[PDB]
Write a protein that binds this ligand. Structure first.
Ligand SMILES: CNC(=O)Cc1ccccc1NC(=O)c1nc(C2CC2)ccc1Nc1cncnc1
Ligand SMILES: [Mg+2]
Ligand SMILES: [Zn+2]
Length: 313
């Protein structure tokens, strides 16, 4: 009850900022998360003995892949933490609990391959789930861990609060399938401008949480340039591996994934920012004004990639 987590001053200050980088020390990331849960949710939200056991089981089930790893899980959680703190009163007690956990769990047991690569490989998980493949696998894994003895961090909730929080988390994790982002934003877009967006409409909240998750999941583009620049190497390390494996199946990969075509990256990142990230954070800022900082950083980094092409770095 009385065992606050505290952080070094720089971390304690910098963590409340959208563009915070959790840093290269694996060993602090668990404490960082618990810090965020206590300030986001309450020191009463979860039994600490239990939370710690869940955190470490969840860490154990992210794999050693260049990008879709434990560092990604916590990065995404922090970005959600930042959004909840800047929109304090808009979100229910359970929405605060379930969302941070969803973010922590959103990529459980990712292998570094896209849904497309499961289908073309004919991986068993593509047999089992025909769309949002990995994402239903990550939700599947989150319930597996939640059901291990001593890991039910949600046990103090009623039967029905429990059914709501798992249902928040499921949609939350499906929402991170970028295949669904495009329709979800276009629907939120029409609803904000026609002016029918109603946050008391639960099908509306669902979409808005869906956008937040896309925004959190994309937040390596909302960092200081030197972070965004270096994280790009990791996402691209996975892409080129997947390309290598597409080549092995007798399939030319999209250039984005072809390591013979690195020259084409700065242009590929241009497309990405314009088609995906700028729109994501635009629509999110229009809905949740305090989240503007994420749009500014995104824009900044777009500018930096233009600069890369112009020979200027
Ligand atoms: C399916 N469609 C696409 O994936 C879009 C695209 C198109 C072309 C080239 C590249 C991409 N994608 C990305 O670059 C990218 N994707 C993602 C998530 C998988 C969506 C996250 C971060 C990205 N970049 C990134 C840059 N810096 C620091 N961190 C991450
Ligand atoms: Mg994912
Ligand atoms: Zn992710």
């Amino acid at each position: 009850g009385l065992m606050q987590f505290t952080l070094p001053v720089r971390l304690c200050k910098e963590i409340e900022l959208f563009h915070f980088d959790i840093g290269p020390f694996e060993n602090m990331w668990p404490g960082i998360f618990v810090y965020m849960v206590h300030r986001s949710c309450g020191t009463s939200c979860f039994e600490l003995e239990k939370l710690c056991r869940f955190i470490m089981s969840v860490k154990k089930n992210y794999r050693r892949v260049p990008y879709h790893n434990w560092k990604h899980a916590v990065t995404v959680a922090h970005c959600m933490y930042a959004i909840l703190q800047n929109n304090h009163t808009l979100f229910t007690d359970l929405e605060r609990k379930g969302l941070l956990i969803a973010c922590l769990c959103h990529d459980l047991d990712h292998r570094g391959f896209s849904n497309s690569y499961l289908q073309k490989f004919d991986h068993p998980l593509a047999a089992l789930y025909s769309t949002s493949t990995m994402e239903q696998h990550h939700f599947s894994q989150t319930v597996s861990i939640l059901q291990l003895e001593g890991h039910n961090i949600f046990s103090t909730l009623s039967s029905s609060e429990y059914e709501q929080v798992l249902e928040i988390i499921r949609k939350a994790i499906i929402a991170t399938d970028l295949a669904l982002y495009f329709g979800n934003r276009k629907q939120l877009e029409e609803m904000y401008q026609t002016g029918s967006l109603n946050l008391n409409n639960q099908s509306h909240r669902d979409r808005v949480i869906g956008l937040m998750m896309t925004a959190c999941d994309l937040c390596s583009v909302t960092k200081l340039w030197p972070v965004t620049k270096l994280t790009a190497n990791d996402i691209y390390a996975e892409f080129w591996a997947e390309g290598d494996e597409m080549k092995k199946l007798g399939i030319q990969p999209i250039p984005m994934m072809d390591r013979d075509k690195k020259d084409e990256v700065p242009q590929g990142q241009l497309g990405f920012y314009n088609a995906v990230a700028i729109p994501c954070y635009t629509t999110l800022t229009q809905i949740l004004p305090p989240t503007e900082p994420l749009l500014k950083a995104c824009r900044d980094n777009l500018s930096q990639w233009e600069k890369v092409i112009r020979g200027e770095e």
